[PDB]
Design an enzyme around this catalytic site. Structure first.
Site, short mmCIF file in Angstrom:
data_model
loop_
_atom_site.label_atom_id
_atom_site.label_comp_id
_atom_site.label_asym_id
_atom_site.label_seq_id
_atom_site.Cartn_x
_atom_site.Cartn_y
_atom_site.Cartn_z
N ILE A 172 26.72 13.69 -48.06
CA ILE A 172 25.38 13.89 -48.62
C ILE A 172 25.30 13.67 -50.14
O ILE A 172 24.52 12.86 -50.61
CB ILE A 172 24.84 15.30 -48.33
CG1 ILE A 172 24.50 15.46 -46.85
CG2 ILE A 172 23.62 15.59 -49.18
CD1 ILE A 172 23.99 16.83 -46.50
N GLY A 173 26.11 14.41 -50.89
CA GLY A 173 26.10 14.30 -52.34
C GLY A 173 27.40 14.75 -52.98
O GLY A 173 28.16 15.49 -52.38
N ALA B 53 30.02 17.78 -59.80
CA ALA B 53 31.16 17.88 -60.71
C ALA B 53 32.36 18.58 -60.09
O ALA B 53 33.48 18.09 -60.18
CB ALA B 53 30.74 18.57 -61.99
N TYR B 54 32.14 19.74 -59.49
CA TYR B 54 33.23 20.49 -58.88
C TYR B 54 32.92 20.83 -57.43
O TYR B 54 33.49 21.77 -56.88
CB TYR B 54 33.54 21.76 -59.67
CG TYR B 54 32.36 22.67 -59.88
CD1 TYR B 54 31.41 22.39 -60.85
CD2 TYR B 54 32.20 23.81 -59.11
CE1 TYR B 54 30.33 23.22 -61.04
CE2 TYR B 54 31.12 24.65 -59.30
CZ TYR B 54 30.19 24.35 -60.27
OH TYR B 54 29.11 25.18 -60.47
N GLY B 55 32.04 20.06 -56.82
CA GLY B 55 31.68 20.27 -55.44
C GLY B 55 31.20 19.01 -54.76
O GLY B 55 30.94 18.01 -55.40
N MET B 56 31.09 19.08 -53.44
CA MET B 56 30.61 17.96 -52.64
C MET B 56 29.84 18.49 -51.44
O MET B 56 30.21 19.50 -50.86
CB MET B 56 31.78 17.09 -52.18
CG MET B 56 31.38 16.01 -51.20
SD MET B 56 32.60 14.69 -51.08
CE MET B 56 32.87 14.65 -49.32
N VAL B 57 28.77 17.80 -51.08
CA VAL B 57 27.93 18.23 -49.97
C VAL B 57 27.97 17.22 -48.82
O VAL B 57 27.93 16.02 -49.04
CB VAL B 57 26.48 18.43 -50.41
CG1 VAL B 57 25.65 19.01 -49.28
CG2 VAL B 57 26.42 19.34 -51.63
N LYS C 142 28.88 22.65 -48.22
CA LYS C 142 29.19 22.35 -49.60
C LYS C 142 30.57 22.85 -49.98
O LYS C 142 30.82 24.06 -49.98
CB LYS C 142 28.14 22.97 -50.52
CG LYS C 142 28.50 22.91 -51.99
CD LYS C 142 27.26 23.03 -52.86
CE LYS C 142 27.19 24.39 -53.53
NZ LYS C 142 26.40 24.34 -54.78
N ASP D 88 17.59 24.79 -63.72
CA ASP D 88 17.88 23.38 -63.51
C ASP D 88 17.02 22.72 -62.45
O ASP D 88 17.52 21.94 -61.65
CB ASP D 88 19.36 23.15 -63.21
CG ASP D 88 19.80 21.72 -63.47
OD1 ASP D 88 19.08 20.98 -64.17
OD2 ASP D 88 20.87 21.33 -62.97
C1 LIG Z 1 27.67 19.41 -55.02
O1 LIG Z 1 26.87 20.50 -55.50
C2 LIG Z 1 25.90 19.97 -56.42
C3 LIG Z 1 24.54 20.61 -56.19
N1 LIG Z 1 23.82 20.11 -55.00
C4 LIG Z 1 23.73 20.93 -53.90
O2 LIG Z 1 24.01 22.12 -53.95
C5 LIG Z 1 23.09 20.36 -52.73
C6 LIG Z 1 22.66 20.95 -51.52
C7 LIG Z 1 22.11 19.95 -50.73
C8 LIG Z 1 21.52 19.91 -49.39
N2 LIG Z 1 21.16 18.67 -49.01
C9 LIG Z 1 20.63 18.55 -47.77
N3 LIG Z 1 20.15 17.30 -47.40
C10 LIG Z 1 19.95 16.17 -48.18
C11 LIG Z 1 19.58 16.00 -49.50
C12 LIG Z 1 19.64 14.63 -49.70
N4 LIG Z 1 19.97 13.97 -48.59
N5 LIG Z 1 20.20 14.95 -47.66
C13 LIG Z 1 20.63 14.59 -46.31
N6 LIG Z 1 20.42 19.53 -46.89
C14 LIG Z 1 20.80 20.73 -47.30
C15 LIG Z 1 21.36 21.01 -48.54
C16 LIG Z 1 21.76 22.43 -48.89
N7 LIG Z 1 22.17 18.78 -51.46
C17 LIG Z 1 22.79 19.03 -52.65
C18 LIG Z 1 23.05 18.06 -53.75
C19 LIG Z 1 23.05 18.82 -55.12
C20 LIG Z 1 21.65 19.03 -55.70
#
Ligand SMILES: COCCN1C(=O)c2cc(-c3nc(Nc4ccnn4C)ncc3C)[nH]c2C[C@H]1C
Length: 345
Positions: free
Chosen positions: A21-22, A25-29, A44, A139
Site C-alpha cells: 500500500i505505502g 520513513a520507519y514503516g510500511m503499509v 502497518k 499532519d
Molecule cells: C507507513 O506509515 C506512514 C503513514 N501512513 C499510514 O499510516 C497509512 C495507513 C494507511 C491505510 N491505507 C489504506 N488504504 C489505502 C490508501 C491508499 N491506497 N490504499 C489501498 N487502508 C487503510 C489504512 C490504515 N495508509 C497509510 C499511508 C501513510 C499515510
C-alpha cells in the site's frame, strides 16, 4: 514469513495474501486477508527501535488510536509482535482496509461539489472528536485521508500527534518543523511550534482548496518559500495581525516585504460554491486567533446539509498532559511499547 517489496512481514498465519500500500520513513503499509474475520485488512509494519524519535512517535500513535473510537478515525483491530522484548524487532498494526486515499483520488478525479461538501464534513467531524480529546493531529494531508467506495472518510497517520499545549506554543523565527510543508500554517514559520488547535484548521483549509481545483494551494519549495506562497494569496498581514507577532525577527521580516494584495478566492476558484469559498476564507486566516474553530466550521452554512450537533460525538476521556518521552531513551520506549501492546497477545 511472507515478504513485501524487500520487507518481511511476520504476521501469519491470521493474515494472508499480502499486497503493498505505502512506504514510510520507519514503516510500511500493506493489505492482507484476515482468516479470523474473513476479510482483507491493512497492516502497518513499524520498525522504530533504531531511533528514539520514531519510538516516541510510535508510542503516541498507538496510545491515541487505542483510546479513540470514532467513525471518521482509523482504529486498531490488532497488534502483532514478538512474545518477548528481546525478540521484538518490529511492531505490526492491523487496521481496517480502505479502498484509497484523497491524495490518490485528487490526482485522477474531478470532485463534485456534493463530494467536496461531504468529504469536508467528515474531516471536520473527525477533527471535532480529536480536538475534543485535547489532541492535535499536526499532519493532516490528502494522503492520510482514506476513503472507501461509498465515500466514507477516515483519518489516519497520528505519528506527529500531540496533546495540545497552548501555553508553550511560542518559538523563534524560522524554527524547524516536521509536518508536511504545503499544509503548514503561516505561524509555524514565524512564531509557533504548532501546539494549538488552530493549526489543524489551517491544514483542513489547504485540503479544501485542493479539493476545489485538484492542485495544492500553497506548494512551497522550501521553508521560507511556503510563507511567500501564503502571503501571495492572503496578501500582506494587517496592523492587528502583526501586533500578535512580538518576536522581532519575524515581525521585521514581514515588515520588510513589499505590499501584496489579496487574491480573491473567486478568482482562484471560479467554479466553486460561494458558501464553500466563504468557509475557505475563515479556515485560511493568517491570524490563528481569528481562525475559525472546528465546531464553528461545522455550523457553517456550507455544511447545513449534514450539520447535526447530536451526531457529532466528542471524546469521553480527553488526554491530560503530553507524555514526557523527550528525554526517554530508545530502550525504555521499547518497554512501554511492549506494555501498551500486551493486550493483543
Ligand atoms: C507507513 O506509515 C506512514 C503513514 N501512513 C499510514 O499510516 C497509512 C495507513 C494507511 C491505510 N491505507 C489504506 N488504504 C489505502 C490508501 C491508499 N491506497 N490504499 C489501498 N487502508 C487503510 C489504512 C490504515 N495508509 C497509510 C499511508 C501513510 C499515510
Amino acid at each position: 514469513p511472507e515478504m513485501v517489496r524487500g520487507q518481511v512481514f511476520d504476521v501469519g498465519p491470521r493474515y494472508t495474501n499480502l499486497s503493498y500500500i505505502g512506504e514510510g520513513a520507519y514503516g510500511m503499509v500493506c493489505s492482507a486477508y484476515d482468516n479470523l474475520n474473513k476479510v482483507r485488512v491493512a497492516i502497518k509494519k513499524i520498525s522504530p527501535f533504531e531511533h528514539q524519535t520514531y519510538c516516541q512517535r510510535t508510542l503516541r500513535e498507538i496510545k491515541i488510536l487505542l483510546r479513540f473510537r470514532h467513525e471518521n478515525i482509523i482504529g486498531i483491530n490488532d497488534i502483532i509482535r514478538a512474545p518477548t522484548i528481546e525478540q521484538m524487532k518490529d511492531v505490526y498494526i492491523v487496521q481496517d482496509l480502505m479502498e484509497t486515499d484523497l491524495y490518490k483520488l485528487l490526482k485522477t478525479q474531478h470532485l463534485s461539489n456534493d463530494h467536496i461538501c461531504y468529504f469536508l464534513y467528515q474531516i471536520l467531524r473527525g477533527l471535532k472528536y480529536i480536538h475534543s480529546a485535547n489532541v492535535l493531529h499536526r499532519d493532516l494531508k490528502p494522503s492520510n485521508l482514506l476513503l472507501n467506495t461509498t465515500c466514507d472518510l477516515k483519518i489516519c497517520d497520528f505519528g506527529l500527534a500531540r496533546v495540545a499545549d497552548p501555553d508553550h506554543d511560542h518559538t523563534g523565527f524560522l524554527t524547524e518543523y516536521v509536518a508536511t510543508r504545503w499544509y503548514r500554517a503561516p505561524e509555524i514559520m514565524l512564531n509557533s511550534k504548532g501546539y494549538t488547535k488552530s493549526i489543524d484548521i489551517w491544514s483542513v483549509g489547504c485540503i479544501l482548496a485542493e479539493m476545489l481545483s485538484n492542485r495544492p494551494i500553497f506548494p512551497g519549495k522550501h521553508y521560507l518559500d511556503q510563507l511567500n506562497h501564503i502571503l501571495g494569496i492572503l496578501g500582506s498581514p494587517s496592523q492587528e495581525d502583526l501586533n500578535c507577532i512580538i518576536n522581532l525577527k519575524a515581525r521585521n521580516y514581514l515588515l520588510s516585504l513589499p505590499h501584496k494584495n489579496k487574491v480573491p478566492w473567486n478568482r482562484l476558484f471560479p467554479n466553486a460554491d460561494s458558501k464553500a469559498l466563504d468557509l475557505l476564507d475563515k479556515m485560511l486566516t493568517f491570524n490563528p486567533h481569528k481562525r475559525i474553530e472546528v465546531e464553528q466550521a461545522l455550523a457553517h452554512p456550507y455544511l447545513e446539509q449534514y450539520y447535526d450537533p447530536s451526531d457529532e460525538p466528542i471524546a469521553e476521556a480527553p488526554f491530560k498532559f503530553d507524555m514526557e518521552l523527550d528525554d526517554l531513551p530508545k530502550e525504555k520506549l521499547k518497554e512501554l511499547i511492549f506494555e501498551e501492546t500486551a493486550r493483543f497477545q
